[PDB]
Design a protein around this nucleic acid. Structure first.
Ligand code: HPA
Ligand code: HPA
Lengths: 338, 338
DNA sequence: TACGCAATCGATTGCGT
DNA sequence: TACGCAATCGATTGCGT
């Protein structure tokens, strides 16, 4: 079709090309003619033809986990914004924590020759670590590790441990000493890391968390429901709960309310994520906020760099959580005594 | 690189190719050699090279609106599943209801030569209608109209009017006659359509909805908050509210609770969407369920058809809403009198 | 029998004149 | 000065032998 254009305008295609990309000077009339031909023919240059010739697709691949979950969804949207903004195209892939799915998506990606790769796989067993190295040639940034687990990628780190600690401290500072916790999968950063930060704050305070008070969630509302229920279902119950993710938390409120428990009058609850609509939870959720957007932009930024400035050295940038006081926490029995 | 392979295996590339695609018979040894070469060289065939030669990219484009919103997010995830499943690649684009953004994304899409297009633009002013026609050559399905607004696309229709009516009736059947409503943007199907279905049920019942009882939302939690508040902020208030979308609804619960209003003891509320976590709203939300997944799969299916079976005629399939009884509705003053 | 030649798909870009 | 020739980017596939 570029031939079709040239001919209509009676110039070579080389010409058509340069005018299309302003890649060299072209006489007005000439330009005009080309433009005209372009219009009638209703021409749209193939980006594939071009990608073949130039050696880059101007498209980036997001190897995600799931995309419905608030947390993820929020990140992804951030990511797309940046792509769009710098003319990149986004290929979204959810491997659902499945190796096969993940091997598959990784292959299509390389095949489709994506300029770079955004990685959000949640859990990283060796085998996954392995595959990724196998593709170290395509530039990539992992967005969900707590620390850099490989020299062949860039990493954006969230300080989930310091976020967990922040959560514990708050409770402690508000008068609590009988706390429970519902963490996310230990196989994840946002899971293991948040817990531990939180646990350090407890040891520091000589607070012991009875194992019947720790219940594993999977970041899903239903998981928060079951755990909360199991915690309050007990003879002896905490006066406060630390829930590893806002969504699971929303599930914890439900249950409490279903047991006719008052939040935060009968139980205080603090989340983690500060998902877009946590403020509208009932009650407005107190939580630790994760800078999801900066988390996306920053990742996209390292990618571009590696891409354009052709950096070779793995890099890593940290981002920081922060506390958001809303209304699910109330003073505890020991407030007055500090 | 395909040359590199051939040579290592001392066969032509034609050979390499057929073995790679099992496109014709190849001697065992031969196959073997090729496979071997493929391995050492660590070969990944360019899908772009191939797309150029075959004339299809095996990738589909989703021209969305936003992707964080529960409703959307849920659809998109459905969509990706199907792509993956039939080997398609997904390009996600959010035009945020912006013509320019939308013209831009549409262009990149054509340029990237996507096999088909999935359309979710929410609002369709003429100008948008115009652009789309300009690309009628690339196959496409609109997923959010209430009726077919063009002969050049396939359409999947949701019966949002019958869903709205379902909502009104429920209330009526539960004893209510003083109702308010918070609809989504009238410029959208899910907005205008739901309202009207709902309004028909009212006229049928000789119920009049005082304009101070209808407050426009934008499907966002904050919008539900403000509206609910404005409704209950009044001297005279309804005993029941019909909220146009679960998320805005979640915002309505918040407000009520903030005004110390009881749900559904002081006010009954019914949503629309049956978003993944409406069951965990506090209280568990009664709502109209939209078959989001079938909505995605069905769309993807029409697309494939047009694509493969090269259909030319616009088609349109309807999907159906249904009621989900949870706990935000309570009997009304007139229950006993029917 | 089993495989290879050469032209094609739509663009870019270094030499030239 | 302002533009064009021809080779290249990585694959497919119809004829042949
Ligand atoms: O893995 C996760 N899933 C869902 N929400 C989350 N918030 C933090 N981590 C996660
Ligand atoms: O346009 C919409 N936006 C968000 N949620 C929705 N649910 C129905 N329609 C919509």
């Amino acid at each position: 079709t570029i031939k079709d254009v040239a001919k209509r305008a009676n110039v070579s295609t080389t010409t058509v090309s340069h005018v299309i990309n302003k890649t060299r000077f072209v006489a007005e009339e000439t330009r005009n003619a080309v433009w005209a031909a372009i219009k009638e023919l209703h021409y749209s240059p193939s980006a594939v033809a071009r990608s073949l010739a130039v050696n880059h697709t101007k498209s980036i691949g997001l190897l995600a986990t799931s995309s419905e979950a608030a947390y993820f969804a929020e990140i992804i949207e951030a990511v797309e914004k940046n792509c769009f903004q710098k003319g990149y195209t986004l290929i979204l892939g959810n491997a659902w924590n499945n190796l096969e799915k993940q091997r598959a998506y990784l292959s299509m990606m390389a095949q489709k020759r994506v300029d770079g790769l955004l990685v959000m796989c949640s859990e990283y067993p060796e085998p996954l670590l392995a595959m990724l190295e196998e593709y170290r040639h395509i530039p990539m940034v992992v967005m969900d590790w707590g620390e850099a687990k490989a020299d062949f990628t860039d990493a954006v780190i969230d300080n989930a441990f310091e976020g967990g600690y922040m959560a514990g401290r708050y409770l402690i500072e508000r008068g609590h000493r009988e706390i429970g916790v519902i963490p996310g999968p230990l196989e994840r950063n946002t899971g293991a890391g948040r817990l531990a930060g939180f646990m350090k704050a407890m040891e520091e305070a000589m607070i012991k968390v009875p194992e019947s008070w720790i219940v594993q969630g999977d970041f899903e509302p239903e998981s928060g429901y079951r755990a909360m229920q199991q915690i309050l279902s007990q003879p002896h119950r905490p006066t406060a709960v630390f829930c590893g993710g806002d969504i699971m938390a929303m599930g914890a409120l439900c249950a409490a309310d279903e047991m006719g428990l008052r939040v935060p009058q009968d139980v205080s609850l603090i989340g983690y994520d500060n998902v877009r609509n946590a403020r509208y939870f009932t009650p407005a959720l107190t939580t630790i906020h994760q800078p999801k957007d900066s988390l996306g932009e920053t990742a996209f930024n390292m990618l571009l760099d590696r891409i354009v400035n052709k950096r070779e050295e793995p890099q890593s940038i940290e981002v920081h959580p922060r506390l958001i006081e809303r209304r699910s926490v109330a003073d505890g029995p020991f407030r007055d005594y500090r």
